[PDB]
């Protein structure tokens, strides 16, 4: 679950995935058209009363 | 009788000494080949080898010999 | 029609196939292709009834 944004990451031609420091997926390659998309979680935050 | 018939570009795309580097290894019945074509005794510095080539054979290797022509 | 191997000089790596049928040597006496008292055939047939 997240929001997809066009990426300026320079993927190597053999690389189709991108990992974070915590080893979750950060960027993914679209299988149909060869373009790179960033993955960012949707907006969140804490609520105080 | 051949099983693997990949069609490739020539490995000497560079026309400088065009030092080729290769890494072959055998892991659990799967052959892995790595390659690099950096241009330059072995020099200093780093040049990571890309896994873009893959020509598996997968039986057993304990001896090898470079073919020449 | 179905065969299996009984004797081998060592164990097998994962996903490895053996086709060559050489006469097994279980002792200090050489075989040289002769099925002697210490030389056995490596392939025995399944008995299916």
Curated annotation (Swiss-Prot), chain A:
Function: Attaches the virion to the cell membrane by interacting with host receptor, initiating the infection. The major receptor is host ACE2. When S2/S2' has been cleaved, binding to the receptor triggers direct fusion at the cell membrane. When S2/S2' has not been cleaved, binding to the receptor results in internalization of the virus by endocytosis using host TFRC and GRM2 and leading to fusion of the virion membrane with the host endosomal membrane. Alternatively, may use NRP1/NRP2 and integrin as entry receptors.
Oligomer status and interactors: Binds to host ACE2. RBD also interacts with the N-linked glycan on 'Asn-90' of ACE2. Cleavage of S generates a polybasic C-terminal sequence on S1 that binds to host Neuropilin-1 (NRP1) and Neuropilin-2 (NRP2) receptors. Interacts with host integrin alpha-5/beta-1 (ITGA5:ITGB1) and with ACE2 in complex with integrin alpha-5/beta-1 (ITGA5:ITGB1). May interact via cytoplasmic c-terminus with M protein. May interact (via N-terminus) with host bilirubin and biliverdin, thereby preventing antibody binding to the SARS-CoV-2 spike NTD via an allosteric mechanism.
Name this polypeptide is given: Spike protein S1
């Amino acid at each position: 679950t997240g929001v997809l944004t066009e990426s300026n990451k320079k993927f190597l031609p053999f690389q189709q995935f991108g990992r974070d420091i915590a080893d979750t997926t950060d960027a993914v390659r679209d299988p149909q058209t060869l373009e790179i998309l960033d993955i960012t979680p949707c907006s969140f935050g804490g609520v105080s009363v | 009788n051949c099983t693997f018939e990949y069609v490739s570009q020539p490995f000497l795309m560079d026309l400088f000494k065009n030092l080729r580097e290769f890494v072959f290894k055998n892991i659990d019945g799967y052959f892995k080949i790595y390659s690099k074509h950096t241009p330059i005794d072995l020099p200093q510095g780093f040049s990571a080898l890309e896994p873009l080539v893959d020509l598996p054979i997968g039986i057993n290797i304990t001896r090898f010999q470079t073919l020449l022509a | 029609n179905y065969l299996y191997r009984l004797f081998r000089k060592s164990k097998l790596k994962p996903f490895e196939r053996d086709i060559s049928t050489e006469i097994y040597q279980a002792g200090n006496r050489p075989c040289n292709g002769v099925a002697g008292p210490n030389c056995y055939s490596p392939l025995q047939s399944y008995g299916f009834r």
